[PDB]
Amino acid sequence: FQPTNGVGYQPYRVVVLSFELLHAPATVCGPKKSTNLVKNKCVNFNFNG
Amino acid sequence: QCVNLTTRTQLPPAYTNSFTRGVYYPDKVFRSSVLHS
Ligand SMILES: *[C@@H]1O[C@H](CO)[C@@H](O[C@@H]2O[C@H](CO)[C@@H](O)[C@H](O)[C@H]2NC(C)=O)[C@H](O)[C@H]1NC(C)=O
């Protein structure tokens, strides 16, 4: 790792994000507002994705 | 800290017939009456 080196030798910080779905009650969720839950209505539900 | 316990009788390991036990839930999915393989 030297600054005098050209393209192809510079250090690159790599972060790999991994996750499993549909196997356990999730806790991490994206930013989305929660609306009121109606009971007897044909609606488009979205529970944890 | 370690203490080597002595004065222990040496016996051969015994065995028994494990009956129909050890069944666990493979997943957290609720199932009412489906015979899931
Ligand atoms: C309990 O027994 C073990 C087994 O011999 C002892 O571990 C030995 O310790 C000596 C001294 O440090 C080593 O030279 C041997 O190589 C060890 N043997 C093994 C198999 O690891 C242990 O010291 C004993 N503990 C007490 C409190 O007497």
Curated annotation (Swiss-Prot), chain B:
Sites carrying sugar chains: 4
Phenotype for residue 6 to R: In strain: Delta/B.1.617.2, Omicron/BA.2, Omicron/BA.2.12.1, Omicron/BA.2.75, Omicron/BA.4, Omicron/BA.5
Effect on the protein upon substituting residue 7 to N: In strain: Gamma/P.1
Phenotype when changing residue 13 to S: In strain: Gamma/P.1
Organism superkingdom: Viruses
Oligomeric and partner information: Binds to host ACE2. RBD also interacts with the N-linked glycan on 'Asn-90' of ACE2. Cleavage of S generates a polybasic C-terminal sequence on S1 that binds to host Neuropilin-1 (NRP1) and Neuropilin-2 (NRP2) receptors. Interacts with host integrin alpha-5/beta-1 (ITGA5:ITGB1) and with ACE2 in complex with integrin alpha-5/beta-1 (ITGA5:ITGB1). May interact via cytoplasmic c-terminus with M protein. May interact (via N-terminus) with host bilirubin and biliverdin, thereby preventing antibody binding to the SARS-CoV-2 spike NTD via an allosteric mechanism.
Function: Attaches the virion to the cell membrane by interacting with host receptor, initiating the infection. The major receptor is host ACE2. When S2/S2' has been cleaved, binding to the receptor triggers direct fusion at the cell membrane. When S2/S2' has not been cleaved, binding to the receptor results in internalization of the virus by endocytosis using host TFRC and GRM2 and leading to fusion of the virion membrane with the host endosomal membrane. Alternatively, may use NRP1/NRP2 and integrin as entry receptors.
Protein name as catalogued: Spike protein S1
Species name: Severe acute respiratory syndrome coronavirus 2
Primary gene name: S
Included range, full protein: 14 to 50 of 1273
